[PDB]
Design a protein around this nucleic acid. Structure first.
Lengths: 148, 52, 183, 141, 124
RNA sequence: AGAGACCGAUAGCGCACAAGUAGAGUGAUCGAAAGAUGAAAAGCACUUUGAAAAGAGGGUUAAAUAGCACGUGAAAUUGUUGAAAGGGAAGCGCUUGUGACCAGACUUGCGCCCGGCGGAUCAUCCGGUGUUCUCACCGGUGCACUCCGCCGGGCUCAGGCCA
RNA sequence: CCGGGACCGAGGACCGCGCUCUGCAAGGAUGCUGGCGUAAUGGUCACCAGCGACCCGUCUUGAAACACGGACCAAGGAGUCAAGGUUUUGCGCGAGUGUUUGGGUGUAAAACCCGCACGCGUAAUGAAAGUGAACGUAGGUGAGAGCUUCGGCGCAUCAUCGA
RNA sequence: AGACUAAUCGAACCAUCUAGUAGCUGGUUACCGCCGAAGUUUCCCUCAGGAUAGCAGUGUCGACCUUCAGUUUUAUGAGGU
RNA sequence: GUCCCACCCAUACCCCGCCCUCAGGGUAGAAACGAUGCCCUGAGGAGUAGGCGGCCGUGGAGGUCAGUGACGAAGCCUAGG
């Protein structure tokens, strides 16, 4: 909508708000990132430190699929079972059954461990697992298998 | 010819907005203020028999 | 002449909401009345927060309210002029009595399943018109992604605007000391 | 509920099909609006109880709203025609307004509108012919 | 019918704020325009030049928009419009639109004479 | 072939018209201006002055203030008539004066007393209907120191401009 | 303590502070009287008169300049659109969010419905192989709006010592 | 003779690339209200120009925190005109 | 050259009226209100480059005035309001 924009309030004032001494010429300073090392160095060194230079080794023909392994913490593990079944377990009316959660189906590969866990035995099937995660799931009463 | 002619809005807001309109369609003071001639109609939500 | 340093200096805080919600306008009328004809500072503070903008009213969560429900507060009224959301980590929800601006679908369901009550601000003024036995809460104001870029500079440990994250982007010179200098 | 007189005023406080806005004041063309001003106090089509006066063939015709049958406009208007005497009509209207708490603030306005309608229903007096002063005195000669 | 009682009417000015240099060029309407030149005389407020419209020239808020008789103008188009002035005999005055047929004009004046409303543009 | 929150004769393609035409250059090439009488030509018979172009009468039309220089017809610029000023510029701002021209406002309203005229019908009660359930409408009775409309006389209050 | 003169009369039931206290000069002007009811008061325009008044736009420390453009009039005439960022305002949902590449259907370029994948976010750090977030009621200290059984509990945020 | 090559020659004329680039001249269209500057520091084949800090506007938020001050008094230090 | 009386006028100072901007208050067992309204109180008003707010006009689109018009719409002229 152009009916309310600052260009409609400039009609009648010569120079259209761009100044009388500096007249808004075409390209004073150069096009693009010109002068990066010469007259725009102050900007490129107060901000963006690290722009120039080379670092690290290179890698020909990277295939991103080789590096697919999304993770999941340990406090969100209980959010993988439906709500109605979940409340039955946490409220304490089963006492004799344990859920076998399969991370791979729900789209996870590694089970990291960050939070706490309630003292109910479970069974986890993962591709990768961390040292801290293993300890917590084991002291709760369950075990973790490797499935590939 | 490549200015932005059409626009895109959320389906949630579409349904919210159309629901609000149906609700206001049952308030007789609004019917008058918008310009209709309903000073005769028996009930403000009309429902015909459907046999007719 | 009068030789002053300031003149015709406007205020600095909002004096009316900039939104045009019809239901929100009703709240403002009601609390204008209450704050004018009462002496409880609870009413005046609630009035001002009704004007604020979405970045000045951050969301609170069941865990944050649950934190303040300890050490002898299990029977006060929590009031939050903001949205109230659910927390997927709190495994067992205590018994509460909340008065908020709007809840989420799951947040409302879980509170009423534990055996509490969810109110609105009009009902709150009808039950406790002076704020007795209440406690006001806020959300985390500095928890936006856009606040980690403020005041960027050398020796500041802030976040830069980069189009991607990886090896080739703003690492070579000025960060590591092995290529020139460091910040 | 979520509907009320106050809410309806919020929706129509800015524009409605009964409004006539131009420079030097705004007016409203309603049947149930006394004094034809645009205000919450006088907007009849929003309040749950209002009054209106319309000139009949010999007298006035007073109309009010029945708070119970609000969702049925066919029978939601109490109508009575006063055609007997000015003073008796004045008394009946004032009592109808401010005796049972049915908008006791429109008493003074209801009486005044009745006075205007009856005042206009009289036979008019003839205007006296104009004069011409200096301009047309020369022309008439 | 005379209008309501009111305080006396003061105007504070009667001239029309003509535009600088409109008496010398024919391609310059006399509507006022802000002179925005570097070294203009009127913009610098020299002595002996045209004045400039300020906000200190405004009129009293009680006597704003009233014609010298005491009423305020109201533009009407048909007979249903002059009926909106039923409750305002002593404050407003009707004014017939310029695109109304001659028959409609005489019809309106009859209804207005009954209602006791002053009409300004009434054909002699 | 169908459409548009597009342009409306200096716009929209260079072209709404005998336009890639008229015209320029040895040549490759360059390349315009120009829409609208009236519903219907009913496109002015006849007389008269003039060498003729044309003019004046007289005609057609709702209109010739539409006459093939044709719908509407602004400004720059020009003619006639009417008013006024001018000793090496004119124009302009503040304030009176003379002359010309002109919009408003007032020309009654309310109330009381006496006399006259005309009418259906004041308070009250009974029946029916509606409604905000105590306030009203309709029908009947009510019949002159009650009520209403008009006229005549007298009286109080108010109402325009300058002092 | 007594005279003489000038300019002004804002407000619109009572409510107050008071005094010389059947009242008052105390929170803002009333009383009596005269002429005229129209060109008389008032307004617009033209001209004479007293005082004042250098040509606009622009660059420049400095413009009325012996600095540049401008004979006059009418129409045309200059910060826009797309992709990608960023902060702020309004809105919907909320640990999730996003229908429209596509399918179903239709009063047909409109409106309405559907879901597998996918994008952003929920986890960082190293060049890399790799590893991967709770001792405490998610810590201690000084301030903090608000609440409070008056003892205290202390949101957001600021400073500091720790994990 | 840098002379002539269609009134054109120290490199003809015609169409396209082409709306070729410009740190340089010229212009940049209605009204009212409130606030209101700089020609200075550092860097650049920088000196008719840019980035950076400063001066300015708008939007707010925390309290109404009771803190502050181009100033004076009292006590106590430094200076080489 | 020194001293002493009276007098003259700035957009400066004092008092009063009016306009706007900013700040502080009152107004629902509503006989109530363009609550974006009304009422009470105090101070201030210069401005290029520049920033923000409010309003007025033009060509088109949706809704509404049951809008105007051959008994005369649009347009144009007018020391007439």
């Amino acid at each position: 909508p152009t009916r309310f924009s600052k260009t409609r309030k400039h009609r009648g004032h010569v120079s259209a708000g761009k100044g009388r001494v500096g007249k808004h010429r075409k390209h004073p300073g150069g096009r693009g990132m010109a002068g990066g090392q010469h007259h725009h160095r102050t900007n490129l060194d107060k901000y963006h430190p690290g722009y120039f230079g080379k670092v690290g080794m290179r890698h020909f023909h990277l295939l991103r699929n080789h590096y697919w392994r999304p993770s999941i913490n340990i406090d969100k593990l209980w959010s993988l079972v439906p709500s109605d079944v979940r409340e039955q377990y946490l409220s304490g009316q089963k006492k004799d059954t344990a859920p076998v959660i399969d991370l791979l189906s729900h789209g996870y590969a590694k089970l990291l461990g960050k939070g706490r866990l309630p003292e109910i035995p479970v069974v986890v099937r993962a591709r990768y697992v961390s040292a801290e995660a293993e300890r917590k799931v084991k002291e709760a009463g369950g075990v973790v298998e490797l499935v590939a | 010819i490549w200015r932005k002619w059409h626009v895109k809005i959320n389906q949630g807001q579409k349904r919210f907005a159309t629901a609000s309109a149906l609700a206001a369609s049952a308030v007789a003071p609004l019917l008058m203020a918008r310009g209709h001639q309903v000073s005769t109609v028996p009930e403000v939500p009309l429902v015909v028999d459907s046999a007719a | 002449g009068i030789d002053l340093r300031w003149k015709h200096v406007r205020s600095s805080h909002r004096k009316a909401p900039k939104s045009d919600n019809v239901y929100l306008k009703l709240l403002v009328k009601l609390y204008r009345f209450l704050a004018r004809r009462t002496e409880a500072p609870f009413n005046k503070v609630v009035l001002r927060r009704l004007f604020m903008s979405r970045i000045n009213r951050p969301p609170v969560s069941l865990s944050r309210i649950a934190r303040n429900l300890k050490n002898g507060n299990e029977k006060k009224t929590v009031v939050v002029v903001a949205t109230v959301t659910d927390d997927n980590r709190l495994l067992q929800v205590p018994k509460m009595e909340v008065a908020a601006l709007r809840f989420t679908a799951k947040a409302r369901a879980r509170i009423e399943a534990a055996g509490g009550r969810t109110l609105t601000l009009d009902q709150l003024a009808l039950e406790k018109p002076t704020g007795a036995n209440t406690l006001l809460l806020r959300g985390p104001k500095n928890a936006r992604e856009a606040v980690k870029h403020f005041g960027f500079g050398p020796h500041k440990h802030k976040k830069p605007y980069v189009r991607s994250k990886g090896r080739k982007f703003e690492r070579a010179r000025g960060r590591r000391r092995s290529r020139g200098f460091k910040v | 509920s979520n509907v009320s007189a106050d809410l309806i005023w919020e929706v129509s406080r800015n524009y409605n099909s009964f409004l006539v806005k131009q420079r030097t004041g705004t007016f409203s063309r309603d049947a149930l609006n006394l004094t034809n001003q645009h205000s919450r106090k006088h907007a009849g089509f929003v309040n749950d109880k209002a009054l209106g006066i319309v000139p009949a063939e010999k007298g006035v015709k007073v109309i009010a709203k029945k708070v119970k049958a609000a969702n049925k406009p066919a029978s939601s208007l109490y109508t009575v025609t006063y055609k007997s005497t000015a003073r008796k009509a004045y008394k009946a209207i004032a009592s109808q307004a401010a005796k049972h708490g049915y908008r006791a603030d429109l008493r003074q306005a209801a009486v005044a509108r009745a006075s205007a309608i009856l005042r206009s229903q009289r036979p008019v007096k003839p205007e006296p012919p104009k004069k011409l002063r200096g301009a047309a005195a020369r022309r008439a000669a | 019918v005379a209008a309501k009682k009111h305080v006396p009417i003061v105007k504070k000015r009667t001239k029309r704020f003509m535009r600088h240099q409109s008496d010398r060029f024919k391609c310059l309407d006399s509507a006022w325009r802000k002179p925005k030149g570097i070294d203009n005389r009127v913009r610098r407020r020299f002595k002996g030049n045209l004045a400039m419209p300020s906000i200190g020239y405004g009129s009293n808020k009680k006597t704003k928009h009233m014609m010298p008789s005491g009423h305020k103008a109201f533009l009407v188009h048909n007979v249903k419009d002059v009926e909106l002035l039923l409750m305002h005999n002593r404050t407003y005055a009707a004014e017939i639109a310029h695109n109304v047929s001659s028959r409609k004009r005489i019809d309106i004046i009859t209804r207005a004479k009954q209602l006791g409303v002053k009409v300004t543009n009434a054909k002699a």
